[model samples]
Target: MDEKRRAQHNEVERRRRDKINNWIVQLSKIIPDSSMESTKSGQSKGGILSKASDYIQELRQSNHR
Candidate 1:
């Protein structure tokens, strides 16, 4: 609750946010299908994640068969 503690907490939070933003940039680059239809609004952040999950599920099922 001191000023120094608050500043340190803020710095840690800033670094965490930056790291997450970097991963989001990397994820957006890799998820498939956008290269074809290619619209800026084509995917939400969760949409990209959902699609990646589904694609991976498919791969798992295909290998099981």
Candidate 2:
């Protein structure tokens, strides 16, 4: 990728990951004994994947009601 394209991609990825991290942090606060430490550091792509999975599951369950 060109330098400009790479920069834009990185920026978008950062925002996407940040949104997931924010959601995880908020969700964690509501669970007993849940702490941010229980989650992998936001740097790992898998961390975002896991959070996204949880988010999707929550949405699915909510839609059933």
Candidate 3:
């Protein structure tokens, strides 16, 4: 309810955002071709997640064999 508390909460959210970006960067590194396309086109988090999930599915297919 106070200004000080609000600023602290905002800083907490900013640190959370940095962690999210770091995790996405790790995912992009594991995803090979999609990572290359993403880096070349400079697409953001959404595209990276999309490509990551599709690549994960392909991995699962091979994993079951």
Best by lDDT: 3
Which one wins on TM-score? 3
Q: Write model 1 residue lDDT over 1-65, tens digit each, in one string.
A: 54454456656788888888887766556756333346565545565675556666887798966
Ranking by lDDT: 3, 1, 2
Ranking by TM-score: 3, 1, 2
What lDDT is obtained when candidate 3 is compared to the true structure? 0.68
RMSD of 3: 4.7
Candidate 2 structure quality by residue, lDDT tens digits, 1-65: 44454456656787887787776655444433212454564444344444545665777898965
After TM-score superposition, what is the CA distance of residue 17 in candidate 3 from its true location, in Å? 2.0
Off by more than 4 A, model 3 = 1-7, 33-41
Off by over 4 Å in 1: 1-6, 33-43, 56-65
* Reference-based lDDT, residue 36, model 3: 39
How many clashing residue pairs are found in candidate 1? 0
